[PDB]
Amino acid sequence: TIPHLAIDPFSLDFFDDPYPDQQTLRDAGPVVYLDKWNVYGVARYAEVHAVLNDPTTFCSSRGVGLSDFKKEKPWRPPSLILEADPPAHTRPRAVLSKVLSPATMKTIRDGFAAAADAKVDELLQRGCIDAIADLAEAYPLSVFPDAMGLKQEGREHLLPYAGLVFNAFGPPNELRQTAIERSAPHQAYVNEQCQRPNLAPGGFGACIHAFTDTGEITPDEAPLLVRSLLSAGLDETVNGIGAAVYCLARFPGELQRLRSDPTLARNAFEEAVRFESPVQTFFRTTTREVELGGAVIGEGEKVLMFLGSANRDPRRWSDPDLYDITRKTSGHVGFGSGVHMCVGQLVARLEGEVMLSALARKVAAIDIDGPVKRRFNNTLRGLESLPVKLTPA
């Protein structure tokens, strides 16, 4: 009843061009079985959405990577939020929600916007730049470590650690094993910065610690919760901004619409998140036997959700392969859905909005002018190098 496929969704060949294989995964059936890794897969929008919104059956506390925490040891102590189910999930989630709240966005918006404007003006003086290293990476590194309240020393470990986190959700292939091997210096840096004295008062990390006074988290929970914000947030946002720049270069009509109404910047970034889905995949583990789209899945089984495929499923989206900055993007699963839906989504949207606003107001054209290179990661989709020439408005 369940079709078995040999597609490896963690192979370099798949990362290089995943979209034909994603259609094969969708059209095979609502539920497939991937023989390469012995997991179930759901690639259509309806089942991916249903699984995300059924946390008592499709749980997160046994890991959201391939590894089942009931069978194997986690490579680092489990996240208190990502790798937890309700009710244990609830109070750490509430703390991060308040630390990254709408009210908090007011305190950082002016500096985040000012840094984006300044970066675009700096890049316009150079003309020919790498939109990853010099923009998609440089901009988040210029605002987010400061807003966390990190010291200057050691920040060279931040991008390597985020790459490791997302490679470690994958299967035990070369990308994962290379990342975890000799990763101790990255872990040691990150764990040290999670201690209260190393976090600047007023920043995100210090505010997490301040919530230990309230009873929502204990002081011994706060370092692991800070760790969540040094794990998530950097690489996915880098990849989303780089994909937006790529899209505005490949779809010049959409850059022109954005230039004509810069208030479309926020939705232009949301559409980039749907289009690219920087987080391609996550797993759940079944807590009981369950029927899903006619498929009977046993207990204790890993279920792979193709978020990127769900965001391109023609059963749900018109012209899913087009970048459309006025698309009604509500309902996309690029940030997840349900109790775990990205608690950092307002920070992500702020960074993406203000960068795309700066481009909309200052740049007349974005032309690819060098070899484009893909960045390979077991969980993240994104570019390594994007040489462009920026023409000033």
Ligand X SMILES: COc1ccc(C(=O)O)cc1
Give the residue carrying structure tokens 């993240």. Answer: 380
Residue of 232, 248, 386, 388 interacting with ligand X (CB under 6 A): 232
Among residue numbers 162 through 221, which ones bind Cl ion (CB under 5 A)?
Answer: 187, 190
Q: How far apart are CA 4 and CA 295, in angstroms?
A: 12
Whose tokens are 């999670």? That residue is 194
Of the candidates 172, 200, 168, the residue with the CA atom closest to the CA atom of residue 74: 168
* Residues 155-174, mask of contacts with ligand HEM (x by CB under 6 A): --------------------
Nearest to 359 by CA among 234, 237, 238, 264: 264
**Distance, C-alpha 195 to centroid of its chain:** 25
Residue (28 or 81) nearer to ligand HEM, CB: 81
Among 282, 155, 169, 334, residue whose Cα is nearest residue 230 = 155
Q: CA-CA-CA-CA torsion for 68, 74, 75, 77, nearest 10 degrees?
A: 150
Closest distance between ligand HEM and the C-beta of residue 380, in Å?
9
Q: How far is the CB of 181 from ligand HEM (least distance, A)?
A: 25
Q: Are 351 and 241 in contact (CB under 8 A)?
A: yes
Write each residue from 68 to 107 as x if it is in contact with Cl ion (CB under 5 A), else as -, in one continuous string: --------x-------------------------------
* Size, binding site for ligand X by CB under 6 A: 8
Which of ligand X, Cl ion, ligand HEM, none does residue 165 bind to, with CB < 5 to 8 Å depending on kind?
Answer: ligand X
Q: What is the largest CA-CA distance in the chain?
A: 60
Nearer to Cl ion, 76 or 362 (CB): 76
- The contact pattern for ligand HEM, residues 112-151, with x = CB under 6 A and - = no contact, is ----------------------------------------
How many Å separate Cα 370 from the centre of its chain? 26
Please report, as ranges, the residues that interact with Cl ion according to CB under 5 A.
Answer: 76, 187, 190
Interface residue list for ligand X (CB under 6 A): 79, 81-82, 165, 228, 231-232, 279
